[PDB]
Design an enzyme around this catalytic site. Structure first.
Site, PDB file in Angstrom:
ATOM      1  N   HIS D 121      33.437  47.951  36.116  1.00 44.36           N
ATOM      2  CA  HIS D 121      34.818  48.323  35.855  1.00 44.36           C
ATOM      3  C   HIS D 121      34.849  49.727  35.272  1.00 44.36           C
ATOM      4  O   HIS D 121      33.840  50.237  34.779  1.00 44.36           O
ATOM      5  CB  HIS D 121      35.505  47.327  34.914  1.00 44.36           C
ATOM      6  CG  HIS D 121      34.865  47.223  33.564  1.00 44.36           C
ATOM      7  ND1 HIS D 121      34.850  48.266  32.665  1.00 44.36           N
ATOM      8  CD2 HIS D 121      34.224  46.195  32.960  1.00 44.36           C
ATOM      9  CE1 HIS D 121      34.224  47.888  31.566  1.00 44.36           C
ATOM     10  NE2 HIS D 121      33.834  46.635  31.719  1.00 44.36           N
ATOM     11  N   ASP D 170      38.117  44.960  37.170  1.00 45.75           N
ATOM     12  CA  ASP D 170      36.883  44.195  37.058  1.00 45.75           C
ATOM     13  C   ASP D 170      36.530  43.569  38.399  1.00 45.75           C
ATOM     14  O   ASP D 170      37.379  42.968  39.062  1.00 45.75           O
ATOM     15  CB  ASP D 170      37.029  43.112  35.991  1.00 45.75           C
ATOM     16  CG  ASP D 170      37.291  43.686  34.615  1.00 45.75           C
ATOM     17  OD1 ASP D 170      37.392  44.924  34.498  1.00 45.75           O
ATOM     18  OD2 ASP D 170      37.395  42.899  33.651  1.00 45.75           O
TER      19      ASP D 170
END
Ligand SMILES: Nc1ncnc2c1ncn2[C@@H]1O[C@H](COP(=O)(O)OP(=O)(O)O)[C@@H](O)[C@H]1O
Ligand SMILES: Nc1ncnc2c1ncn2[C@@H]1O[C@H](COP(=O)(O)OP(=O)(O)O)[C@@H](O)[C@H]1O
Ligand SMILES: [Mg+2]
EC number: 3.4.21.92
Lengths: 161, 100, 333, 192, 192, 56, 90
Positions: D121, D170
């Site tokens: 991420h 994510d």
């Protein structure tokens, strides 16, 4: 050269006793300390012998005695005390008898400090009792005119210096 | 004083009982004459110094480098000379057998 | 004297494997004895000795290999152990005891004693943290004038500058030391190479590449390593190697029993299948070649205990089940 | 508590910790939140291993949920600075920072266990104060995001646009998926 | 504190702690909550034992109430990767994560004490944030649950559907019940 | 010098040497002088435990 | 028997006594067995040297008295003993 002059002057045809000077060959391991001794015996006209300090031990113990060094010399001199009292000796591994970090002397270093104490009178000169061959006779050999060379590696001595 | 590469090279030939001379006589018994090149001895010293074996290492280095050389000579005749080169010490090359 | 090939041929007759080691000893012995015989050297040069060093696991044929050289020649031979030797001034014995056994074996003959050979076993186990024994033994090597009593009274002294010293031992862990030097230092981890297959060539191969630095790490004093310029490596007897030991060697285990069996007109057929089982048992208990005799002895004791009980016996057939102990070799009549 | 182990050697006996024993084998453990203190310990181990033997690979086990970016970059630069190849093995999980270090290992030496999670991420940060200060920190965090994306693309081999799109939010990748994405080279399921 | 014990060997007398002493016999203790730090400790011990002797089985005593799934997966992957068989023994209790590792031992080498309790439940998690990112985490937990059930079914031997039904809610199994369910192979009641 | 009953030299050896200087004359040897160098070496090792007899 | 070189006891009396019972015949003498009892008491762990002293006559030896120097290649040297401590060694 000086030893020969002393031997030729053994009759003390002067006002002095021409004392002797012993050598201490402190060289790095593998530099040829033992070689210098073996090569010196090829041109020596007097009895010469070699010895190891690790085998030597204080008197009264199972280990070898300091007087055994002179015993080897007699063999080279045809068991002649006169010739043996003017020979040369090259002690080896003299750096192994050094005190093993036991200056307080918690225990008697028979293999260490004990060997040095017994050799004090030998280097300076003392009538030692050597076995007849190898205790009934205890032949007396004077080591006052015998030169004693000591060779060792002294591993770690550089740090001290 | 500690022995250096230069000292080892001199000790390999200068001494009357040098390691190189000892092997030369060994080969003389069979009849072949052994020769040690200058560069060969130079590499020998470098190997001994690297291994920290010193002078004593010289005998081990030569033994391994000449083991195969003397393993056939007693039963392999017709040879007259065996030249040694630096490459022989490393093992890449082999003795330059000469016939005559 | 016989050329290295002749010595190797004799070794192959009584030894299976260790070709590299046999070459070293064949050349070493040839040179050592050549120097002794040619003491003059045709010049003023004083040829120096080249002590031998043997490295191999237990039951690798080191003792047998050394015995072959002594048996081939007409010189004495002696054995010793390093764990028994100790320093001077201690309850343990000294290195001089080694020379004591050499004179007795040599019949107190200086000439015959010099040409003799001496072997040492378990050279390891006395490394740094002990060091004193190496220093005491360091004198014997390179030359000494040690004295021994006679008629065991001139105390005949034998020089140790013309005697060959063959030091052998089983180095445990030396493979790991060489591995790091000659391979990746992975040790423990997912990307490492764990010796889980029981490779019999890894140790032999690694040991063959041993170098002085490896010995230094093991604990061997550099001076002692220098006294031993010649080095030989022996591999561990694998399954296939053991099978050959039972029939290939001149005085093989099978041949000895076959000679005893045929003496009474009885053939002894050693099934090739039974031989592998015999060798497998040795590896299971890690008894080495020494255990081979005991394995066969038990299997043949019962067979040879009843063979003379009856007459007309014509032949015996050892089988796989006989080695396991669940069957008896069928007798022919 | 860390158990003690004994290493039997011909020279003599010796005692070592569980982690210290594996350190001698060129193995480093990266566990817990990434921070300057733990990062320095890893950097020191890498420097020590390089001095002992600069020709042997170093194995680094990554199992952490990530952490500070500066601390993580301190390890990434050390891996590339030292000539020895730093092999990375993912155990349990490898978050943003952990995944970045996992893919930073030498090509062909990046491994991952069959049951392991990998998450990548964009950097996370925050600053409070005057508007002028916000722009300074806002621009810096953006540069870090771009710099990390460039490094991820180089190691994984993916395009810059692809890394940015996948790193925006994510993204959980399993061990088999990490191989195709380029984060790792192979999967270690059993010892051969 | 941790008592110290003396071990007699050829070299001499050596002092060992209770846990380190048992580590020599290939015995590893898995006590307390499963986390990354303790998980790495067990992984290091397993790797160390493999190098010492890759042919001797390793014993793992499991007494824990569960923990992080990622941390536990690191131990599971290590157990299956190392060639030596890992024998799992349940002492006191074995929760979801503990039960998963308990049933992950080599088939036939899984044991449980007579009064031990084994409980298995689906993975537990949570996330707070937007609807787009929560969907990512909500979708990842399901993958872990599915993967966890597949592994549980493979080791236990029961069908995947049966595992899902029993894993939907907490289910406690006694030592004898665990044998029928396949989580354990036998029960150790006395030394023979 | 060493305690009696050991391989080391005995104390009585000192008198034997004195006799040689006196032509083995007991009357003469009973009135001579004797010097014992390195007497500090035979000093007991106080620190050493009183377990092994210090023959030397 | 004592160790090699010792004068307390004769180590070659075993080969000599055998011929006495064998009417001093080489064939008769080199046909039986020679049982040497209590060999473990002298075994190592001076004692070790005794083993070598006996090995002098166990193989390759010609020592007999009518000096007859009769070989012992056929004599079966069956050494017996309790080997106190061998059980724990194994
Ligand atoms: N300076 C040197 N010149 C010639 N040979 C040397 C020299 N130093 C060592 N050697 C070699 O070393 C061997 C003997 O080593 P040694 O003298 O025992 O070492 P150390 O002096 O440490 O005792 C000989 O074979 C010799 O050829
Ligand atoms: N290749 C071989 N062939 C026949 N016997 C062997 C062989 N190798 C070893 N042995 C047996 O092993 C014994 C000697 O082992 P040894 O050399 O002492 O092993 P190590 O030196 O490894 O301890 C001998 O009795 C011999 O019968
Ligand atoms: Mg020397």
């Amino acid at each position: 050269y000086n030893h020969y002059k002393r031997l030729r002057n053994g009759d003390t045809s002067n006002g002095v006793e021409l004392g002797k000077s012993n050598i201490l060959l402190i060289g790095p391991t593998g530099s040829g300390k033992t070689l210098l001794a073996e090569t010196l015996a090829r041109l020596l006209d007097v009895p010469f012998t070699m010895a190891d300090a690790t085998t030597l031990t204080e008197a009264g113990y199972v280990g070898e005695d300091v007087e055994n060094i002179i015993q080897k010399l007699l063999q080279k001199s045809d068991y002649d005390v006169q010739k043996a009292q003017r020979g040369i000796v090259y002690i080896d591994e003299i750096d192994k008898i050094s005190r093993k970090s036991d200056n307080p002397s918690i225990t008697r270093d028979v293999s260490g400090e004990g060997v040095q104490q017994a050799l004090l009178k030998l280097i300076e000169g003392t009538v030692a009792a050597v076995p007849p061959q190898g205790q009934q006779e205890f032949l007396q050999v004077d080591t006052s005119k015998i030169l004693f060379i000591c060779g060792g590696a002294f591993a770690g001595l550089d740090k001290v210096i | 004083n500690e022995l250096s590469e230069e000292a080892l090279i001199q000790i390999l030939k200068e001494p009357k009982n040098a390691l190189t001379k000892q092997y030369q006589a060994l080969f003389n018994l069979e009849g072949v004459d052994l020769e040690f090149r200058d560069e060969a001895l130079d590499a020998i010293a470098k190997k001994a110094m690297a291994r920290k074996t010193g002078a004593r290492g010289l005998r081990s280095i030569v033994e391994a480098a000449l083991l195969d050389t003397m393993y056939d000579l007693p039963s392999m005749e017709d040879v007259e000379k065996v030249v040694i080169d630096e490459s022989v010490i490393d093992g890449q090359s082999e003795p330059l057998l000469i016939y005559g | 004297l016989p050329t290295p090939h002749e010595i190797r041929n004799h070794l192959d007759d009584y030894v299976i494997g260790q070709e590299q080691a046999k070459k070293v000893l064949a050349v070493a012995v040839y040179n050592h004895y050549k120097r002794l015989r040619n003491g003059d050297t045709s010049n003023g040069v004083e040829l120096g000795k080249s002590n031998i060093l043997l490295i191999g696991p237990t039951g690798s044929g080191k003792t047998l290999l050394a015995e072959t050289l002594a048996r081939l020649l007409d010189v004495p031979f002696t054995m010793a152990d390093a764990t028994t030797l100790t320093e001077a001034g201690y309850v343990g014995e000294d290195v001089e005891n080694i020379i004591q056994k050499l004179l007795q074996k040599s019949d107190y003959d200086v000439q015959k004693a010099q040409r003799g050979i001496v072997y040492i076993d378990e050279i390891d186990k006395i490394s740094r943290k002990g060091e004193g024994v190496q220093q005491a033994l360091l004198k014997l090597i390179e030359g000494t004038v040690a004295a021994v009593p006679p008629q065991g009274q001139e105390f005949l002294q034998v020089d140790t500058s013309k005697i060959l010293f063959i030091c052998g031992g089983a180095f445990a862990g030396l493979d790991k030391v060489i591995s790091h030097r000659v391979e990746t230092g992975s040790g423990i981890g997912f990307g490492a190479t764990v010796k889980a297959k029981s490779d019999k060539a890894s140790e032999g191969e690694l040991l063959a590449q041993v170098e002085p630095e490896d010995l230094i790490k093991f604990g061997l004093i550099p001076e002692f390593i220098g006294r031993l310029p010649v080095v030989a490596t022996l591999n561990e007897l694998s399954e296939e190697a053991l099978i050959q030991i039972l029939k290939e060697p001149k005085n093989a285990l099978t041949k000895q029993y076959q000679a005893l069996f045929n003496l009474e007109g009885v053939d002894l057929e050693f099934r090739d299948e039974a031989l592998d089982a015999i060798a497998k048992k040795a590896m299971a208990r890690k008894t080495g070649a020494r255990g081979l005799r005991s394995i066969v002895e038990a299997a043949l004791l019962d067979t040879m205990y009843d063979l003379p009980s009856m007459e007309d016996v014509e032949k015996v057939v050892i089988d796989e089940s006989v080695i396991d102990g669940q069957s008896e070799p069928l007798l022919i009549y | 508590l860390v158990p003690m182990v004994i290493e039997q050697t011909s020279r003599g006996e010796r005692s070592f910790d569980i982690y210290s024993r594996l350190l001698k084998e060129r193995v480093i453990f990266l566990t817990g939140q990434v921070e300057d203190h733990m990062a320095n310990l890893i950097v020191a181990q890498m420097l020590f291993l390089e001095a002992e033997n600069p020709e042997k690979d170093i194995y680094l086990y990554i199992n952490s949920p990530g952490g500070v970016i500066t601390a993580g970059m301190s390890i990434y630069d050390t891996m590339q600075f030292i000539k020895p190849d730093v092999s990375t093995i993912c155990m349990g999980q490898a978050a943003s920072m952990g995944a970045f270090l996992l893919t930073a290992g030498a090509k062909g030496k990046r491994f991952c266990l069959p049951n392991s999670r990998v998450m990548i991420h964009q950097p996370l940060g925050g600053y409070q104060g005057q508007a002028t200060d916000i722009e300074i920190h806002a621009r810096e965090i953006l540069k870090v995001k771009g710099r990390m994306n460039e490094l991820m693309a180089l190691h994984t081999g993916q395009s810059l646009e692809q890394i940015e799109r996948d790193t925006e939010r994510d993204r959980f990748l399993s061990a088999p998926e990490a191989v195709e994405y380029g984060l790792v080279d192979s999967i270690l399921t059993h010892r051969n």
